[PDB]
Amino acid sequence: VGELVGARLIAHAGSLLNLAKHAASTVQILGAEKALFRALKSRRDTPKYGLIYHASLVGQTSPKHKGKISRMLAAKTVLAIRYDAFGEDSSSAMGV
């Protein structure tokens, strides 16, 4: 996801272990907390970008496809979060 965007994610969750406990859909909308609760109270459509909007892959893709890339990026991202939090080995093979 990148150095800056990943760093903000831990800052929002407060720790790497706390971020590990989260599901894939929560990571997608970690940043967009104001749009989520407004939508849920007014029964509108929920947000889809969150903090992931500034990720490299989301930036390059077309605005029509920024909805698909958001969930695809997020779902694979949590596989990296769990592995780094609980794995005892430091390597970038799985991430690549």
Binding site: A20, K21, L79, R82, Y83, A85, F86, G87, M94
Partner: peptide, 12 residues
């Protein structure tokens, strides 16, 4: 094949 991806569930 990575076991770590589901080890968060036991902690919860």
């Amino acid at each position: 094949e990575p076991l770590e991806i589901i080890l968060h569930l036991p902690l919860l």
